[PDB]
Design a protein around this ligand. Structure first.
Ligand SMILES: NC(=O)c1ccc[n+]([C@@H]2O[C@H](COP(=O)([O-])OP(=O)(O)OC[C@H]3O[C@@H](n4cnc5c(N)ncnc54)[C@H](O)[C@@H]3O)[C@@H](O)[C@H]2O)c1
Ligand SMILES: Nc1ncnc2c1ncn2[C@@H]1O[C@H](CO)[C@@H](O)[C@H]1O
Length: 467
């Protein structure tokens, strides 16, 4: 019945990855609580689960939690540089299909996404774990291409869209109507990150969303923990391993002051950096002012700034024109999305600019006047591409949300639309992580609960409370 199938860099790394997974398990009380609560009953028993999410040690604990509660799983990474090859080998060695390695080409990246989606002839996932929406995109675009085949000849100059179109042309030639066949079996997708959730709301607004979606990013125990304190840890780690640069006394520019930018600026400040924030939103800008940061434009900073971190989810933050005017050896990295926050394509196609590799994921771009910039991870996620991403404890919060979302998509009735988990579940995720930290929660008396108008067991806040 069950065939072994995987594609990883180096299976001899499996034992090392398995040791790191065992360490991570002891840092992830929320995921272990999910195994303890659901491991016998197996609410996801036999349910086909496709995952597209950074193949890290932390993700390995999520995969094997979903497996412990019954899932029939296939996995790929959502980023060409974020896979930890030893974690991928350890997952493959424990007989879960995984198609992921550090340093994929874009063609390989999309081929792995397709491998993780296709469970068999005319068979796809019933649940999807997604991070950034690329697996969701492939399914929606393949479905659309059955009705509108001309979109597969339209890339709009974008090389990656050409790659996706070529893949979908081949898929639909091999299995005509594949996506209209498998889409009715998809019970839903749970989406990890701000950018992927933006794609979901856009599809829902246009009425093109094909199945229910849980916005996991906007659990309070995800957005206000992972995005902030995960980055506070892992931006520093990515910069350290890539460059070993001392931050103290350096002028560091954080582009964007949402949840990611807030955690990045706090990390930099704690290491003695002079932190500058850029923002388009006057509210987030005023928050940066109240925290003691200087709020400027990128243009204002070019003559003096030492390091640039893009954290916007937007494009064209750091342009070729900017980089021409930067100080020599300025470090440029992206912790937001994709690879277009920095104009890497412009760097690579500007005839006078010479690219010189320093070490893996660290590249010098030398300009005719003799100054250079240092680009990290080809402009992709620096925390995951140059280091190991967020640490396990905070990913346990994000991934406990993922696990509860998966169970809910399977067990509960959803209409097509985008949903968030109930506040009582959000509160439960937080509860599951308090004991490990030694925190002791206060219990309301009956009189106190009446006075503020809540059930003593929650939820404790109005639905639009912002924390
Ligand atoms: N690397 C990681 O581990 C990690 C973790 C969580 C989220 N993310 C990603 O980080 C990105 C940001 O996430 P978030 O949750 O902070 O989103 P967010 O919406 O809360 O914050 C982004 C901010 O960027 C600002 N911004 C937009 N365009 C700008 C521009 N041109 N110049 C300056 N500022 C601009 C917006 O005003 C906004 O406040 C997303 O792509 C998200 O998916 C990455
Ligand atoms: N070690 C990590 N393992 C898995 N996912 C991570 C890790 N660090 C950050 N991420 C996720 O990557 C997303 C961005 O693609 C963030 O929303 C975050 O949840």
């Amino acid at each position: 019945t069950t065939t072994i199938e995987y594609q990883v860099k180096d299976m001899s790394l499996a034992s090392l990855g398995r040791k790191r997974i065992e360490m991570a398990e002891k840092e992830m009380p929320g995921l272990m609580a999910c195994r303890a609560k659901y491991g016998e009953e197996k609410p996801l028993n036999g349910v086909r689960i496709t995952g597209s999410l950074h193949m890290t040690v932390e993700t390995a604990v999520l995969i094997e939690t979903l497996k412990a509660i019954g899932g029939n799983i296939r996995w790929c990474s959502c980023n060409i540089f974020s896979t930890q090859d030893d974690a991928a080998a350890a997952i493959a060695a424990a007989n879960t299909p995984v198609f992921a390695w550090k340093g994929e080409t874009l063609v390989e990246y999309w081929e792995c996404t397709w491998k993780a989606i296709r469970f068999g002839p005319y068979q796809g996932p019933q649940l999807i774990v997604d991070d950034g929406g690329d697996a969701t995109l492939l399914i929606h675009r393949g479905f659309q291409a059955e009705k509108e085949p001309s979109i597969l000849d339209e890339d709009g100059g974008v090389e990656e869209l050409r790659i996706v179109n070529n893949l979908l042309k081949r898929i639909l030639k091999e299995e005509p109507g594949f996506f209209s066949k498998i889409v009715p079996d998809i019970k839903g997708v749970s989406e990890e990150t701000t950018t992927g959730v933006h794609r979901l709301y856009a599809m829902q607004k246009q009425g093109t969303l094909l199945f229910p979606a849980i916005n996991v990013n906007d659990s309070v125990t995800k957005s206000k923990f992972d995005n902030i304190y995960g980055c506070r840890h892992s931006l520093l780690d990515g910069l350290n391993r890539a460059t070993d640069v001392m931050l103290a006394g350096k002028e560091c520019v954080i582009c964007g002051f949402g949840d990611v930018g807030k955690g990045c600026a706090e990390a930099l400040k704690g290491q003695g950096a002079r932190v500058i924030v850029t923002e388009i939103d006057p509210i987030n800008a005023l928050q940066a002012c109240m925290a003691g940061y200087t709020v400027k434009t990128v243009e204002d900073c070019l003559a003096t700034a030492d390091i640039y971190v893009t954290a916007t989810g937007n494009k064209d933050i750091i342009t070729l024109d900017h980089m021409k005017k930067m100080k020599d050896m300025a470090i440029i990295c992206n912790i937001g999305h994709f690879d277009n926050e920095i104009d890497v394509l412009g760097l690579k196609t500007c005839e006078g600019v010479k690219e010189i590799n320093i070490k893996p994921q660290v590249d010098q771009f030398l300009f005719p006047d003799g100054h250079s910039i240092i680009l990290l991870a080809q402009g992709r996620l620096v925390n995951l591409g140059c280091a190991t991403g967020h640490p396990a404890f905070v990913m346990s919060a994000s991934f406990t949300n993922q696990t509860l979302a998966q169970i809910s998509l399977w067990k509960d009735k959803y209409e097509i639309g985008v949903y968030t988990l109930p506040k009582v579940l959000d509160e439960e995720v937080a509860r599951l992580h308090l004991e490990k930290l030694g925190a002791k929660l206060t219990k309301l008396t009956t009189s106190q609960a009446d006075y503020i108008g809540v059930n003593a067991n929650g939820p404790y806040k109005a639905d639009h409370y912002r924390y």
